[PDB]
Design goal:
It is classed as hydrolase. Keywords: alpha/beta hydrolase, serine esterase, hydrolase. The assembly is monomeric. With 290 residues, this protein is α/β, with parallel strands linked by helices. The chain has one domain (2-290). The chain is built from eight helices and eight strands. Strands 1-2-4-3-5-6-7-8 form an eight-stranded mixed beta sheet, with helices on both faces. Helix 7 links the parallel strand 7 (226-231) and strand 8. Helix 3 (118-129) crosses helix 6. Bound molecules: the ligand O=C(c1ccc2nc(-c3cnccc3C3(C4CCC4)CC3)oc2c1)N1CCN(c2nc3nc(Cl)ccc3o2)CC1. The site of ligand A1IZ4 has 28 residues, from helix 4, helix 5 and helix 6.
Length: 290
């Protein structure tokens, strides 16, 4: 009987890739009609999925890039216990597998990464693993420094799980309303059956803590060009992290745009913010694929 997504759709009916642990990842592609100028992988965040990037991906495809993505293990239409990961590096390993597969299929093209939130930490660690190989990285509110208060509170729970055997302990859910000022986008997020909005399993939050630690160690060695988009009112990925990334990265091509008063999900924020975000990514990628 065929392997099916967690929503019961046979993988044989969907674009997919099998990762190094034998788990099926659901994949998406947006390719232009002409010859592609470059490849770009879209790296989604915690609890969400690649389908949330439809509009951004179609904009990038319109610049003649071949955009590709997958749902990370434990997310969306990919396999794995929901919101569990044996180690955070699994996400990076799987991105690298998909990139390597695509570069075989479409050789000679430069490859970019775009990542948001947890997906931005994944993007940072992916570029850091392959210094010199990626042409550029677009980061929308990447997880660099967590909100200090939320992180300290969580670290209490983390102390229980790290010192005891408590496999089912969970944090309280994040309030989706404090992550975008656009109430319609919040309602869409709350309506999407592929989003996990349950409280975070403490074991997974521990891997996010590992992600923050690894990102810190990676920054002084990062050299990839990057565009960094950050809201000043981000209640999850603290803006201090974006400033620290600008300061500590060794990249010779680094740009920060701060959106004053904007919340975390900048590409699903108020129209004037999101329109700027799309425009600024368009300009930055166009200039680096000319
Ligand atoms: O990638 C992440 C993401 C990043 C980092 C996180 N950290 C925790 C977390 C959860 N529980 C306890 C503690 C924590 C900590 C971590 C840091 C180490 C421990 C912050 C203390 O959850 C996170 C989630 N996201 C992207 C998708 N997502 C979204 N998309 C949305 N679109 C709209 Cl329109 C409205 C709303 C939305 O929300 C949600 C955000």
């Amino acid at each position: 009987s065929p392997r099916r997504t967690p929503q019961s759709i046979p993988y044989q009916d969907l674009p997919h890739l099998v990762n190094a642990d034998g788990q099926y990842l659901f994949c998406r592609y947006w390719a232009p009609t002409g010859t592609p100028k470059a490849l770009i992988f879209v790296s989604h965040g915690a609890g969400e999925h690649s389908g949330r990037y439809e509009e951004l991906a179609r904009m990038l495809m319109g610049l003649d890039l071949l955009v590709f993505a997958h749902d990370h293990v434990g997310h969306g239409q990919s396999e794995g216990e929901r919101m569990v990961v044996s180690d955070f590096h699994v996400f990076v390993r799987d991105v690298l597998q998909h990139v390597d597969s695509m570069q075989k299929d479409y050789p000679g093209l430069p490859v970019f990464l775009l990542g948001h939130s947890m997906g931005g930490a994944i993007a940072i660690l992916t570029a850091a693993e392959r210094p010199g190989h990626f042409a550029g990285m677009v980061l929308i509110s990447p997880l660099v420094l967590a909100n200090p208060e939320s992180a300290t509170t969580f670290k209490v729970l983390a102390a229980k799980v790290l010192n005891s055997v408590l496999p089912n302990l969970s944090s309280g859910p994040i309030d989706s309303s404090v992550l975008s000022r656009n109430k319609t986008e919040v309602d869409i997020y709350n309506s999407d059956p592929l989003i996990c909005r349950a409280g975070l399993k403490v074991c997974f939050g521990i891997q996010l803590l590992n992600a923050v630690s690894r990102v810190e160690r990676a920054l002084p060695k990062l050299t990839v060009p990057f565009l960094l988009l950050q809201g000043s009112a981000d209640r999850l990925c603290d803006s201090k992290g974006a400033y620290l990334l600008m300061e500590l990265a060794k990249s010779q091509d680094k740009t920060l745009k701060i959106y004053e008063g904007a919340y975390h999900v900048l590409h699903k924020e108020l129209p004037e913010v999101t329109n700027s975000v799309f425009h600024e990514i368009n300009m930055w990628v166009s200039q680096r694929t000319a």
